[PDB]
């Protein structure tokens, strides 16, 4: 059992109408992460990532430069980066 972290994310850019949520869920699962992703009312994509630090950090880089193939990302805001006792999530859902 490694040090587990959680981080909140919000992604600004051409991120809706580009299958962003599907590809986020897929990549999170590929990297062994749990959490969630949704569209927000301000046109951004938002969620949390939880998992081992190297895995979360990789997904953070994904969210900074890549996302779904047709998306382009202006900014990824991260906050509430915290060490956690255990995962709060058992899967990675698209929730909104």
Residue numbers in the entry: 3 to 98
What's written in the study?
Here we used a pair of thermophilic/mesophilic acylphosphatases homologues (acylphosphatase from hyperthermophilic archaeon Pyrococcus horikoshii (PhAcP) and human common-type acylphosphatase (HuAcP)) as a model to study how local flexibility of the active site affects the enzymatic activity. Despite remarkable conservation of sequence and structure at the active site, the catalytic activity of the thermophilic PhAcP is significantly poorer as compared with its mesophilic homologue HuAcP at low temperatures. The salt-bridge between the active-site residue Arg-20 and the C-terminal carboxyl group is found only in thermophilic PhAcP but not in mesophilic HuAcP. Taken together, our data suggest that the presence of the salt-bridge between the C-terminal carboxyl group and the active-site arginine residue increases the activation energy that results in a stronger temperature dependency of the enzymatic activity.
We then questioned whether the introduction of the salt-bridge into the mesophilic homologue would result in the same observation. Firstly, the C-terminal residue of HuAcP was substituted with a glycine residue (HuG99) to engage the salt-bridge with the active-site arginine residue. Crystal structures of HuA99 and HuG99, resolved at 1.5 Å and 1.7 Å, respectively, demonstrated that they were superimposable with a Cα r.m.s.d. value of 0.17 Å. In a good agreement with our original design, the salt-bridge between the C-terminal carboxyl group of Gly-99 and Arg-23 at the active site was only detected in HuG99, but not in the pseudo-wild-type HuA99. Regarding the Arrhenius plot, both HuG99 and HuA99 exhibited straight lines that intersected also roughly at 298 K. The salt-bridge bearing variant HuG99 illustrated a steeper slope of the Arrhenius plot, i.e. a stronger temperature dependency of the enzymatic activity, as compared to that of HuA99 lacking the salt-bridge. Importantly, the activation energy (52.5±2.5 kJmol−1) for HuG99 was analogous to that for PhWT (49.1±1.4 kJmol−1), while the activation energy for HuA99 (29.5±1.9 kJmol−1) and HuWT (37.6±3.1 kJmol−1) was comparable to that for PhG91A (32.1±1.7 kJmol−1). The distance between the C-terminal carboxyl group and the guanido group of the active-site arginine residue was less than 4 Å throughout the entire simulation of PhWT and HuG99, denoting the presence of the salt-bridges in these proteins. In the simulations of the salt-bridge bearing PhWT and HuG99, the side-chains of the arginine residues populated mainly the native mtm180° rotamer conformation.
